[PDB]
Amino acid sequence: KVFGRCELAAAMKRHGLDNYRGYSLGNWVCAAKFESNFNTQATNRNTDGSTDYGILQINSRWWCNDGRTPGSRNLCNIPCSALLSSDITASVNCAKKIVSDGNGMNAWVAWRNRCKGTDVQAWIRGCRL
Numbered sequence: 001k002v003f004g005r006c007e008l009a010a011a012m013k014r015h016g017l018d019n020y021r022g023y024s025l026g027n028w029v030c031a032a033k034f035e036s037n038f039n040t041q042a043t044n045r046n047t048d049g050s051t052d053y054g055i056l057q058i059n060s061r062w063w064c065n066d067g068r069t070p071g072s073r074n075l076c077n078i079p080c081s082a083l084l085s086s087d088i089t090a091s092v093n094c095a096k097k098i099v100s101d102g103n104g105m106n107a108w109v110a111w112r113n114r115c116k117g118t119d120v121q122a123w124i125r126g127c128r129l
């Protein structure tokens with residue numbers, strides 16, 4: 001599914017990401033924009049052989065099992081394919097574990113380089129929610 005901006009903002013707020021560990025909803029929307037272009041089906045292979053999955057590009061090196069990332073962890077206790085669903089529940093629940101692990105949203109390279117320190121409220125401007 002390719003979400004609209006406000007449709008994804010509403011879904012993320014319903015799943016408890018608004019101000020989760022102090023990150024406003026616009027941070028999560030901005031991160032999803034630059035990680036996946038709001039596409040739940042997005043996949044991208046990393047140089048080290050891991051893959052990033054779904055709307056928030058969650059990495060098989062640590063967080064999910066994709067059957068082909070040797071010596072990796074599955075800290076969200078999910079198959080990586082769960083992260084590609086039209087239903088963002090699995091991605092949000094796993095993202096809450098990632099952002100809680102000590103590095104905050106710096107785990108998301110696109111958030112650090114494109115969202116951090118910008119006017120992220122712009123991402124939810126005009127949205128009903």
Ligand code: VO4
Nearest residue numbers: 046047048050061
């Ligand atoms: O892309 V690599 O060590 O898995 O983060």
Ligand code: VO4
Nearest residue numbers: 015087088089090
């Ligand atoms: O109700 V689903 O969040 O598991 O749309």
Ligand code: VO4
Nearest residue numbers: 052057108109110
């Ligand atoms: O999941 V992202 O680390 O590719 O920036």
Ligand code: NA
Nearest residue numbers: 060064072073
């Ligand atoms: Na893994």
